[PDB]
Nucleic acid binder design. Structure first.
Ligand code: ZN
Lengths: 64, 101
RNA sequence: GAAGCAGAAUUCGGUAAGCGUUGGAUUGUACCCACUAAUAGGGAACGAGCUGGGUUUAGACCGUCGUGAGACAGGUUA
RNA sequence: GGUAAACGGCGGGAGUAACUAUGACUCUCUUAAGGUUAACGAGAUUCCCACUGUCCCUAUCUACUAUCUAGCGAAACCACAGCCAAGGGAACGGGCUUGGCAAAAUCAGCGGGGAAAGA
RNA sequence: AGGGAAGUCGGCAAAAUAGAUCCGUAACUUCGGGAAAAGGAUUGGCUCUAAGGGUUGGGCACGUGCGUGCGGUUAACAACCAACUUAGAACUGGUACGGACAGGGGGAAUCUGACUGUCUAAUUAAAACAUAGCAUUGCG
RNA sequence: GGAGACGACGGCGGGGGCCCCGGGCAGAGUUCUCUUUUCUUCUUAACGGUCUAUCACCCUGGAAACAGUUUGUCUGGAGAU
RNA sequence: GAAGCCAGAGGAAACUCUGGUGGAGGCUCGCAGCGGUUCUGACGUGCAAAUCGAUCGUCAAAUCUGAGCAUGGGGGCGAAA
């Protein structure tokens, strides 16, 4: 859910995943040489949080 | 200080030339095309802060203003004031012209 | 040489070792990808060149076993 | 009798049965824990940017050697010696057999073999 | 040179970073840190400007150079002396300005030991030992 | 009773010595050009006399409108300035 | 850049914030010293029966170290190999 991601990263207003990773990189300082955001490293951080449960998510049970 | 001085003269480390900078200053189309040759999201400050004369992008307006106070920018000022070296100047050095009838 | 083998691309077989038979990914532990004419198989080791595992002196930890010193179904580090 | 921050170990009760110890057999409860991992490290592992002769694929330069000369000058090792092919039942051959063959005396390298690891 | 880990068990080795001033700095956290995080802008020479100090010195009235009784805080002024920092500006060379020397590569994670410390002199420096903290035992 | 007789660390102040700068005498060097130039000697022991030197102590006096004061906040009606 | 201390702005007070001062820490970069991480290192009948180079750990202390003394082998001593 979007509000969980916004509460987790204190970050909001993105239009897509690319802009989300870019603003997360600019906020967290994940920058390459020349002020270029590290979208690969930020995506790896997000995936690590997703599988380690820092980001809350679940699969809803089937309705009877 | 210059980063990685030993491979500064490699072709992959080449910088923009002064005649190209004069063309960017005179015509906004040349500067425009040089800007679509770059990705805007991968530039410092989202490509919003740029010195045409030094051909360099900066992270902030205060960074650009601090850049304008230093000596590399003033050397670029004096080089642009003297004028870049071009093919027409090269021909005029040897006294060579073009006959178009 | 033969095959519904029209052509193109082949398939099966014969003489032939003259000449070639590559570059990579993956160690939570041999198969994939691409180029190429093709990426054929072996011997001279497996009846004191160098370097990674089987592999294991001395230090240490965890698991199993033992009253114990210690040993090992084992796993890791130097 | 007590004792588990002793070593250890991971359930209890009832029915049945009635010397002693056992077991077997049913029945029934079956639970401590749900909505600070920082800092530091010549510790072990994976990845990203930068960076480069790590590599494609090697090339060139310098100093000291190695080389030659004057002087000085050992050691390891050493049954005897050192070209191969085939056979030599004891899957060994440098000497034996049968062949190939085979020409003085030397210098720089080389690491196949012999030799060489306080082996 | 061009490519930039395609090399290799493995980025081994090498390269890159590095001084100082300024902008800026995330997650996490025992709130102390992390942190020089990350990511950026500059740095020569010459000629100037500005700021930051010290020492000495106040006027009358009497008695006799002294003492007193006063008066007065623009000394906010004069004279003399003195050294190193800091900031700003113009000009100028450039391929380079911490010009030699000196001098962090950085980041995302995981396991591990709390940390500082110690040991197998002559193959192992470590999750080993020690450590504070915790708990128990014996003794009047 | 005192001296003998006593830890480690931090900033500050005094003194000796060394370093640095200026003038003067003498000597030396450079001098195509420049440099009233650069370099060298210019010292004063133990032991004594005399005049001074932080802390501390003494006398007068009695402090709020609190004061004195160190880079560092200590002191003062148990008597400060 | 820890306590302590000064000034200013608020707050009835307690306290809160800002700018300083201060110089603590088995803190940290790093020279000497001490130690001994890494290199397909040098060296391998060596300079050396353990040396040499670059790199590395630590560097105000559980730091380094001399001399005098004590513990003596079925013993000592051991931050324990
Ligand atoms: Zn500019």
């Amino acid at each position: 859910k979007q509000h969980h991601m916004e509460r987790t990263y204190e970050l909001r207003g993105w239009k897509d995943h690319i802009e989300f990773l870019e603003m997360l990189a600019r906020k967290s300082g994940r920058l390459l040489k020349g002020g270029e955001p590290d979208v690969d490293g930020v995506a790896k951080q997000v995936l690590n949080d997703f599988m380690r449960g820092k980001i809350p998510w679940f699969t809803p049970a089937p309705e009877p | 200080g210059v980063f990685a001085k030993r491979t500064m003269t490699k072709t992959r480390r080449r910088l923009r030339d002064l005649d190209q900078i004069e063309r960017d200053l005179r015509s906004p189309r040349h500067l425009q095309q040089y800007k679509e040759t770059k990705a805007a999201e991968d530039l410092p400050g989202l490509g919003l802060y740029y010195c045409i004369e030094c051909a360099k992008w900066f992270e902030s307006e205060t960074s650009l203003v601090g850049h304008r106070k230093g000596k590399p920018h003033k050397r670029r000022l004096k080089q642009l004031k003297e004028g870049a070296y071009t093919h027409e100047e090269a021909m005029a050095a040897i006294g060579y012209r073009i006959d178009n009838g």
